[PDB]
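Quick bug: Host translation inhibitor nsp1 output formatted oddly.
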Amino acid sequence: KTHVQLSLPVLQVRDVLVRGFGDSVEEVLSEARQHLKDGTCGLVEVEKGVLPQLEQPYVFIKRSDAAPHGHVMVELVAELEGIQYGRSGETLGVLVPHVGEIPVAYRKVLLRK
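Here's what came back:
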């Protein structure tokens, strides 16, 4: 399928144990996609002070379109030293590995895969 319905645990930035997916734009997009497929991906909502507490390169979920079945349609965009790889809409947040942190909410998305 070109899209997959996912329910992503929303994590507080200070609870996150593994604060990024790797060391290159291509690696972080790859790992983010593997973790999304394996159900081991969390979401951190971006506010003042969040990104400096996470590791670059960043993987964002961005709105790809305007929402089936309550799931916002999203795609992945990476960012390294102020350059983005991908073009999309509003940031829903930054993806991180999930290793059992307790979420504050779940965010339903339809991921372009």
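Actually, after a second look the formatting is fine. The first helix runs from residue 25 to 38. Closing.
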